[PDB]
């Protein structure tokens, strides 16, 4: 339900699609999201060490799961259990990343 799709073939891996649940959770309108990198959800309290692990996963085009603090439009802190999956065409060329979010502090 709660997910976005980025196009890594376009500059800085912009969000091309965002699910209604995502717009609801993050409090942003679709118009504010389309063409942005998803890093705008990060903020002061976001562990940079965890952000680095996401950068490595995108570089190596591997799937990853991490928990990190994210901010809504209004600046409300929420824990994001974030799941990144690379997505390839028939020829095995990377086409998209899908990013699934789950809201809550799962690991204390
Ligand atoms: C499909 C997709 C969804 C993403 N969703 C989130 C997210 O919900 N929260 C977040 O903090 N970062 C998310 N990211 C990570 C950022 O977009 C960015 O790649 C990350 O912060 C590391 O790159 P940077 O060092 O250039 O910021 C997502 C990335 C992709 C490709």
Swiss-Prot record:
Provide the PAC domain boundaries: 62-103
**Parent sequence residues shown:** 389 to 491 of 915
- Gene that encodes it: PHOT2
PAS domain mapped to chain residues: 1-61
> Domain comment, in the record's words?
The activation loop within the kinase domain is the target of phosphorylation. The PAS (PER-ARNT-SIM) domains are required for the binding of FMN chromophores.
User: What biotechnological purpose does this protein serve?
Assistant: The flavoproteins improved LOV (iLOVs) are fluorescent flavoproteins engineered from PHOT2 by improving its photostability and brighteness, and which maybe used as oxygen-independent fluorescent reporters with a small size. The iLOVs are PHOT2 fragments (385-496) and contain many amino-acid substitutions relative to cv. Columbia, to confer different properties in term of stablity, brightness and color.
Q: List S-4a-FMN cysteine occurrences by residue.
A: 38
Name the chain's protein. Phototropin-2
Domain of life, source organism? Eukaryota
- Consequence of gene loss (knockout): Plants lacking both PHOT1 and PHOT2 have curled downward leaves missing color changes and lower petiole angles in response to weak or strong blue light (BL). Impaired proton H(+) pumping associated with altered increased ATP hydrolysis and absence of binding between 14-3-3 protein and H(+)-ATPase (e.g. AHA1 and AHA2) in response to BL in guard cells of plants missing PHOT1 and PHOT2.
What does the entry's PTM section describe? Autophosphorylated in response to blue light irradiation. 2 molecules of FMN bind covalently to cysteines after exposure to blue light and are reversed in the dark.
Q: Which residues bind FMN 2?
A: 37, 39, 42, 55, 70, 80, 82, 101
The recorded induction information for this protein reads: Light fluence rate-dependent induction, independent of light quality.
